[PDB]
């Protein structure tokens, strides 16, 4: 039967739009962090009312991932970082609502494959992130010096 | 209000089709493993392009199950074995893309409440399956002599 579309056949089954996929691509399961361009492109779609909502929800679905998928949670936090600094005000306030999800990720355990502390990058980045969040002074200044 | 038929409602509320239900029943949380009949049924329905997609996703939605459901992950693997061995070629190529889910299952931790680990049953069938999967020569010979 047909062949190379099968990658995109998957996303259709679950009903992911290209915006949901670009987030799913940005938070991939490999190691390469997030591409420099993908972030500003998600920064643009953060203003787009429809896309915006698709983005936020996908990160929350990515933040509450298993112990095994440390990289989803690793990349997700860098994405959430780029939006609160470059994207819309909508982005910051969203995080403030479900702030407990980030505070919980401070303590993430995954030293199982096969002993290496892989889940520290998750802990540290979250702690590093929410530190930037809770303060009001350092937020508004960074945004003014970006746009 | 009603009695035994309420079971079907549970599968209704989540919007499960006949095939989506047959997958969940064969790949249930019992230790009896799948039925030989249920295998060739899902192998046959694998040819049907409508059912074909439901199966893969329901097998995928069951491979990333929690620690507690070790029996789901085991049967799901042994199911994919039958389809890569008997069913439509479409199935095999599906697996080649979501190989990241298969590769990671080589290791899997499950301390078993009573004090055991199976645990390995999940680990081992994965290792044994992908080893069969990765080879191009073993596949093409296996199917031609079965059809």
Author numbering:
A (entry chain A), B (entry chain C): 1 to 147
Cite, word for word, the article reporting this structure:
Clathrin-mediated endocytosis is essential for protein retrieval during neurotransmission and receptor recycling. Accumulation of the adapter proteins at the plasma membrane initiates the endocytic event and contributes to membrane bending. Complex formation has been observed between the ENTH domain of epsin and the ANTH domain of Sla2, the yeast homolog of human huntingtin interacting protein 1 related (Hip1R). Epsin and the phospholipid PIP2 are essential for clathrin-mediated endocytosis, and we show how assemblies are formed between the ENTH domain of epsin and the ANTH domain of Sla2 in fungi.
As a further indication that the ENTH2 dimer, which sandwiched PIP2, is functionally relevant, a similar dimer interface is observed in a crystal structure of the epsin Ent1 ENTH domain (ENTH1) from S. cerevisiae at 2.9 Å resolution. Here, a 2-methyl-2,4-pentanediol (MPD) molecule from the crystallization solution has caused a displacement of the α0 helix to allow dimer formation between ENTH1 domains. Native MS on a Thr104Glu mutant of ENTH1 from S. cerevisiae shows a reduction of PIP2 binding, where the binding of two PIP2 molecules is barely observed, indicating impairment of the binding site.
